[PDB]
Amino acid sequence: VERYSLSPMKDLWTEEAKYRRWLEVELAVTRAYEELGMIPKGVTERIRNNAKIDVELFKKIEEKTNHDVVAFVEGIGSMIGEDSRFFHYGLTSSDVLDTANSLALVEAGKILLESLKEFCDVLWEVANRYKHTPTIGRTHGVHAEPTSFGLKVLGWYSEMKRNVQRLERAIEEVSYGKISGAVGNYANVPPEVEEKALSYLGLKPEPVSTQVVPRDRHAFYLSTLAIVAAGIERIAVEIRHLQRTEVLEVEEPFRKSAMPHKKNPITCERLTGLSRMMRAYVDPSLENIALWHERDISHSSVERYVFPDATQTLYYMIVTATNVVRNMKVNEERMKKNIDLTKGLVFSQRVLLKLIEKGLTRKEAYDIVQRNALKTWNSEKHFLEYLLEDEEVKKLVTKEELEELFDISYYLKHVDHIFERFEK
Amino acid sequence: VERYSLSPMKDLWTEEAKYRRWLEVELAVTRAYEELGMIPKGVTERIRNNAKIDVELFKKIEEKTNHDVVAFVEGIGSMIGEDSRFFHYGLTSSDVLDTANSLALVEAGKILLESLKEFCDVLWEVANRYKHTPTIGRTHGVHAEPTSFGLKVLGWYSEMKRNVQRLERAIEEVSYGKISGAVGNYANVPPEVEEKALSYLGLKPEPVSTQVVPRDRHAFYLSTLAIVAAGIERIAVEIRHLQRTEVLEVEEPFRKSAMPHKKNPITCERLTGLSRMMRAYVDPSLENIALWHERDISHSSVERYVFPDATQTLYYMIVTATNVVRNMKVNEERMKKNIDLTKGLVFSQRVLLKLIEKGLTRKEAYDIVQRNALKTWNSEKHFLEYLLEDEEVKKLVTKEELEELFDISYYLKHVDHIFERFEK
Amino acid sequence: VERYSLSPMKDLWTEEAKYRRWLEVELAVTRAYEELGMIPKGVTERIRNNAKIDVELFKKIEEKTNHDVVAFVEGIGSMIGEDSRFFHYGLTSSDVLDTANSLALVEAGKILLESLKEFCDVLWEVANRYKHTPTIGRTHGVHAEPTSFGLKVLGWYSEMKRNVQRLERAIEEVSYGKISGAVGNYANVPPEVEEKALSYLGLKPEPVSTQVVPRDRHAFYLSTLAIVAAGIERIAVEIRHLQRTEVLEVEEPFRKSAMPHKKNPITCERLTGLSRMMRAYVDPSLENIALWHERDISHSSVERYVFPDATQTLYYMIVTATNVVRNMKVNEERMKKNIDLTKGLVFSQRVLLKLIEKGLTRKEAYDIVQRNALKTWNSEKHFLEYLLEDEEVKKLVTKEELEELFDISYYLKHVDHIFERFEK
Amino acid sequence: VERYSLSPMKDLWTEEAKYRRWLEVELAVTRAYEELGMIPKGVTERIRNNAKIDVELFKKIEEKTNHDVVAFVEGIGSMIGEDSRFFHYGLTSSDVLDTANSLALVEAGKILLESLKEFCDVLWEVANRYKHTPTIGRTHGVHAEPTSFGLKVLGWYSEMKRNVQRLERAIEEVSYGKISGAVGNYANVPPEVEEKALSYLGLKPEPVSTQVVPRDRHAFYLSTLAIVAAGIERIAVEIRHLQRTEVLEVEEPFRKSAMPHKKNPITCERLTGLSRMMRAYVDPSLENIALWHERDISHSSVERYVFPDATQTLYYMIVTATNVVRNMKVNEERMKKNIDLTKGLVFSQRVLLKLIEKGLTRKEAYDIVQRNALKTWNSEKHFLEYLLEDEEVKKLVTKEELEELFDISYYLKHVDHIFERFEK
């Protein structure tokens, strides 16, 4: 979907880029044959000088051929004269197709990784900026206990740092190509040429290939991408809840005057939808693993959708989420005020416990708290004021003692130690 | 589904086992508080002596409570007298639930890993046993070039060895628990107690938790399990094709006389179906990542299906596939004979190339080969015999030269080097 | 997951129930052969008298057999004397297995359909109860324009009425059985027997079967169930939002005093999670369609999870959602008050339009409205009051004219027309 | 993926086509207001004359707007003079967007439905062509009992006829539009306008809409499409098996001489892969149902992939499968010869039964049949010949009686009855 495509990534997935990768692979193989003394000196440099990418010519030949790599080999053959004898020498089409897709998934992976590290840098900056900003923790959508907004963002940071390590592992998993010929056993092209040719490309040889590179590698890479997307979805759902009219704690960046009451979290709603497409790609990638014998080509039509679409969608997601967190407005005063929306009832467990500590049993303290909690809920007077006027409370706790149970500081006392876990 | 449950694994997922894990977690926390001097000496040893698992009592209390951990804490409270003051001290229910599920997924992971390493040992033994057994490589279900059956099995070995490393990484990802209280910020239980208590359990502290352990860890573990399952599905589909009546190259082990013509690959068809359920669990696990704020409990009902079912299904798959490969009959003579099903036409590319090497151009050689190939296909006479009687061939190649193009040895010459990549 | 299992539905999926369905199919077949004069008069009644379900016996035989239907046939054979010659005569195992699963899915469908009609009845009652209750319509989680809460609930009613029709069609789709023998062509059991036997069971003959009933029927049924579930998820997500502390418009029923500030929408979170499982079953059901030739048994292991689990889960969801909507508290006064949370800005488009109607151009009216909207947003004074004090407004519109733009009755004027579409 | 796009279907999903549908919806609305006397006579005709689709202009405005429908409305407004007062009057953006997607999915549905009926016609022709052609029925990939190839193809016909009915129902489900304004309650555009406008477009009014048309309709449509696709996958997997070198019963059409031994079922492998994508779109479509309140826009990004891609992919699958089945080669002599691959053992159950009929018990007959089956399996001599030479057989059955058990006509006797169920 062109509206989500962004440079560097979208340049990777053009037809010109694909043919440039197929020629890269073929020239690494001729270079390796030549370096081993198997083809005459000078061949690689002459093919490098004569072989040009002409998409229109390859596509025209493919109309006759109906086989894309064969048409490319014939098209290049037409430019390189007698050196065609040593071009594509012993290879099967998937030696070029799969090695070029490893090049592409490695490159897309590095683009993704750089953008994810930038996202982590933005999340660290924002978590530290609001490290001591109080906000109400919410469980089941219901106010629970105070916490820090910085710590909420640090949770996102921690997840994206896990996803950096996962994406480095997925890049390693797809760093394998194959130059092993028709059914993967080097009958027609030597394993010495594979090892040398793939090392020139920055790739490793599949230790055993068939006609193709085994598709559990690609399924691992795309499952990884979907987990990164789902972490971004988690952040986007949070911002959507926090921008709702009854909450008003954050506002995603927008246009660039606008109506104050109509600021909608559209970017984060879009990111949530794109996470659904990233996880939709996992199942067909897993179904591609069980190819018949030394291969069938059912995976090729799936991968024409999934390789360019999963990588471009996730790149859009990361860059977009980065700008959201970097530039979102954070309404600190409103966060603080929202702790007091229930008029002190967030501190009810501390009051209950103090009433037990001062002698009473769970059920007696419970009934005092519940009675004052119901009066608070149904009126304008705050919980502390009801408790201060309660005679049973007045006999058990001093006013200073009671008031210190309403301190937000109780809840934020260990925030530093949690941040210190990341200054590793 | 009880018919696929197998000891050790099925013992992990009983109600008794779950309550034993919840008590394990609670006693690690009291031990840590006591070791830090926060609760009186002697408490842990007295709760360890008095706290017993009584499933019927906890379940009865839960009918009143409607909250499973609270009923367990109340039930244990009823056995431990005054030491109940220091039991579950400052914890939220998910500190026990999620830490106990980390214990369970770690243990299930180790059971899985041991069985997968055993599977790799069986695949190595079988790949080496048939290292030099010739068989026809097949692409698109169509005979391609000769290869070795051992090398086909080594391909399965290579995949299961990748899955050993992946499953070690997934065990590490789920080795994190949390003892951080209501919204994950240690307001009510110190981070020193979490770190000590989790180290007694063999777990690490989530560096930042909310009320729960972040669910991208569980999605990573279950995506890993589905990729292992899909690798087993790949082996099972291969055995199903190879047992078909027209192929008869392998036969999965059976009953224990049976009718020779009615041996069906039922075990491998069952394994293919169970792979569909393992990949079905990935999507709902990915959808569980985006919990609202500091948690909602939507994931808990999914995980009641997925945690016990994914781990028990994959364990059944691994153990079962191990017995299949260990005991399957491998019909070496039939594999060899099947190379000659097309009467020599597997060697047609070598014949074509030789005719070009001896002067002719691609299209002339092609037409000689195609004409003799069509006569072969439509008759009982073999390709070599047609070629020996062809006058154009007779002028270009000696009979010895022609006959050596029909050598299977050409295709198997690099098998050792591929096996040597695994003697690392 | 036993915890979500509920009578009648759970009674359908026991081992006893399965063998009772297998016996029902066999007795329908003997009845049909007998009515066609192909077996002696009296056989069916005798087998009916003698054939008892003994689960322990069938299981013990199946340990020897390893084939469930064969063990059942042998076990019944041991009870029926010389009538065993006429029992299971000409049948293949899937004639019994697939016809009995059609019985099961038809009966589960009818249980589901009656519960869903009851859910519709509850939704109609609740939508009419709050037919004219004002509430704020919300788009992107942001207040948009007033509407009625009864209209919101009528949208749920409308969806569940579509799901009643869809479930009726899904029942029809699975109302097909097969009594056609080994490869579905009546070589061993006559088509007149199938037609008669299935008519006694309330089923139609698959017009052409293989060894099995084609699995697109089961995938259509399960796809249908997942859509019903997602409709319940939509309702559950709405109640979760409306129960949040900042909104407080509805509260799901609970326990049965409780703390007023800690009412969590746990049932609706559980329903959201169960909908993820219902949609997870669709993929494996679609993968089961492409069986090899006249069948493979890969689907059987999947359907052992999916058939009982999809039907029991959805029945739990429907019954549970019905009780939620039936007994939820609806806070009408809070709904009305939340319309004024933005202090009149929900009527800003009417003000804008009136200013244009009284001469001004879009941009001039926008600037007046935006200026007064910003003042409102950042203060305590209401929008109407800023407009009444604005000199440009005062020259264009009377106070009566301005004030009638703040009327909720403008937004509810076509509620009755919408409800009439669903009447008699 | 442009490579699978085919006219008419691809013409539906261009930007030009989208804006032409948006204009059609707007003109239906102006026509309805005009026919109800709410806007002046002649407006609709003038707007129709003046409103031109200028994709470059709308895109340029949308760079400023960032809202696609608003930019279209502004662009048209610049062409229609004072009639802009009456254009888009009272509408919300999704009144246009969702009604236009209903137009699109209805038209794509009708394109699909006509191609699927044509596919049924081809399947009926081919099933009748081979109505009595003998072939071996295969269960678990193992030869079972003879049947007819026409019956196999009639099973595909039967499935595609079920899919015709399902696609008709899916078209009806998406035949709903909405012209109900911001939160779906007609505050700003009257219900009589919606009813009239949608009737001009061939659509019905959603009986209760929110800001959007409810997304269970789209999920039902896409679920339906995925089931059609899996039926095509079933056919493609069958042709792949039958084209394998060991079977050689069918060959898909190809290029247009080719090598006889290297005909690969590449089209059917591609169809298998495209069915994986069709089922991958179901999950995200089901996840789009649970939109927040009166809508969020998370579905819009998903539907930008799924609507054009699901409909174009399935149309490519149907047209392509139709040409495969129309032009595939069917090797009748090979089908007949493959029945005798096991040298008569396909009739072993008839022999077993005859031996029991002539007195013997199940176990005695089993042992005679198994002994002669094993001899057959391990030699060149046929089963009938071993039975004719067996002394226990010779005492129980005449040669004529034995020989008539090897008659294929026993297995095909009810083919005509099955085809009659589908006649006139």
Query: DSSP per residue over C36-60, as a string?
Result: TTSS-TTHHHHHHHH----HHHHHH
| Chain B neighbors (3+ CB pairs < 8 Å) | A, C, D
Distances in Å between the Cα of B186 and the Cα atoms of A361, B204, B209 are 25, 16, 10
DSSP classification of residue A341: T
Which positions 290-309 of C are in contact with B (Cβ < 8 Å)? 292, 296-302, 304-305, 309
D244, D341, D370: residue with CB nearest B259: D370
Contact (CB, 8 A) for D349 and D37: no
Counting every residue, how long is chain C?
A: 424
Nearest CB to B141 within list D243, D257, D341: D243
Catalytic residues of B: 67, 139-140, 257, 262, 269
Helix (H, G, I), strand (E, B) or coil at C204: strand
Residue A146 pairs in a beta bridge with A136
Q: Decide: helix, strand or coil at residue C139.
A: strand
Residues of B in contact with C287 (CB under 8 A): 276
Residue C222: other Cβ atoms inside 10 A: 28
Please tell me the distance from the alpha carbon of residue C159 to that of residue D220, in angstroms, as a whole number.
12
Counting as contact any 3 or more CB pairs under 8 A, the partners of A are B, C, D
CATH topology of domain C1-91: Fumarase C; Chain B, domain 1 (1.10.275)
- Lookup result for tokens 């040429």: A193
Does residue C3 have a known ligand-binding role? yes
Nearest to B348 by CA among B328, B368, B321: B368
Question: Which residue, A263, B335, A257, is CA-closest to C140?
Answer: A263
Nearest CA in chain C to D145: C183
Instruction: For residue D289, give the nearest of C236, A266, C138 by alpha carbon.
Output: C236
Provide the residue type at B68 as one letter: D
C143 assigned to active site: no
Pick the CATH number of B343-423 from 3.40.720.10, 1.10.40.30, 3.30.70.60, 3.30.465.10: 1.10.40.30
What are the residue ranges of CATH 1.10.40.30 in chain C?
A: 343-423
- The candidate with the shortest Cα–Cα distance to C160, out of A220, D214, A391, is D214
D15 interface with A at CB cutoff 8 Å = no
- In Å, what is the CA distance from B264 to each residue of A189, B251, B272, C71? 39, 8, 14, 18
CA D15: distance to chain centroid? 26
Residue ranges with strand state E in A252-372: 329-330
The β-bridge partners of D148 are: D134
Q: Where are the domain boundaries for CATH 1.10.275.10 in chain D? A: 1-91
Residue type, A119: F
Provide the 8-state DSSP code for A288.
Answer: T
Contact status, residue A235 vs residue A317, Cβ threshold 8 Å: no
A183 with B137: Cβ contact below 8 A: yes
Q: Closest CB to A230: pick one of B144, B279, B286.
A: B286
Which of A244, A257, A266 lies closest to C370 in CB terms?
Answer: A257
Q: Which helix (H) or strand (E) holds D267?
A: helix D266-280
Q: How far is CA A395 from CA A350, A358, A369, A386, D273, in A?
A: 17, 10, 15, 14, 76
Architecture of domain A92-342: Up-down Bundle (1.20)
Q: How far apart are CA B215 and CA B217, in angstroms?
A: 5
Tokens of D422: 């589908």
CA atoms of B106 and B172, how far apart (whole Å): 8
Asked if B264 and C211 count as a contact pair (C-beta separation under 8 A), the reply is no
Residue B160: exposure state from Cβ atoms within 10 A (0-12, 13-18, ≥19): buried
Q: Are B302 and B284 in contact (CB under 8 A)?
A: yes
In a 3-state reduction of DSSP, which class is residue A40?
coil
Residues with Cβ within 8 Å of D174's Cβ and at least 6 positions away in sequence, in order, are D102, D105, D106, D109, D217, D218, D221
Q: Does D148 touch chain C (CB under 8 A)?
A: yes
3-state SS class at D405: helix
- The maximal CA–CA distance of chain D, rounded, in angstroms, is 105
Contact of A127 with A392, CB cutoff 8 Å: no
Bridge-based pairing of strands C134-139 and B329-330 is: unpaired
Tally of CB atoms within 10 A around B184:
28
Please list the residue range(s) of chain A that carry CATH number 1.20.200.10: 92-342
Catalytic residue among C132, C140, C293, C299: C140
The DSSP output letter for B225 is H
- Residues forming beta bridges with residue C205, ordered by sequence position: C177
- Alpha-carbon dihedral sign for residues A262, C240, D286, B308: positive
Q: Which runs of consecutive H residues, i.e. helices, occur in D51-148? A: 55-65, 68-77, 93-129
Whether residue B186 contacts residue B96, with contact meaning beta carbons closer than 8 Å, is answered with no
Structure tokens at D420: 């009659």
Strand, coil or helix: B375: helix
Contact C105, C389 (CB under 8 A): no
Question: Where would I find the beta strands (DSSP E) of D150-292?
Answer: 176-177, 204-205, 250-251
Residues 382-421 on B with a CB inside 8 Å of A are 410-415, 417-418, 421
Q: Quote the CA–CA distance of A270 and C343 in Å, as a whole number.
A: 29
- Helical (H) or strand (E) element with B330: strand B329-330
User: HSE on the CB side for C158, CA within 13 Å?
Assistant: 23
Facing residues of D143 across strands? Answer: D138
* Helix axes B55-65 and B15-35, enclosed angle (nearest 10): 90
Closest CA to B315 of B96, B2, B5, B3: B5
Residue A199, SS3 per DSSP: helix
D13, D312 contact by CB (below 8 A): yes
B416 exposure class (CB count in 10 Å sphere: 0-12, 13-18, 19+): exposed
* Beta-strand pair C250-251/C329-330: antiparallel
DSSP A379: S
User: Are the CB atoms for B239 and B328 separated by under 8 Å?
Assistant: yes
Nearest to D211 by CA among D151, D143, D296: D296
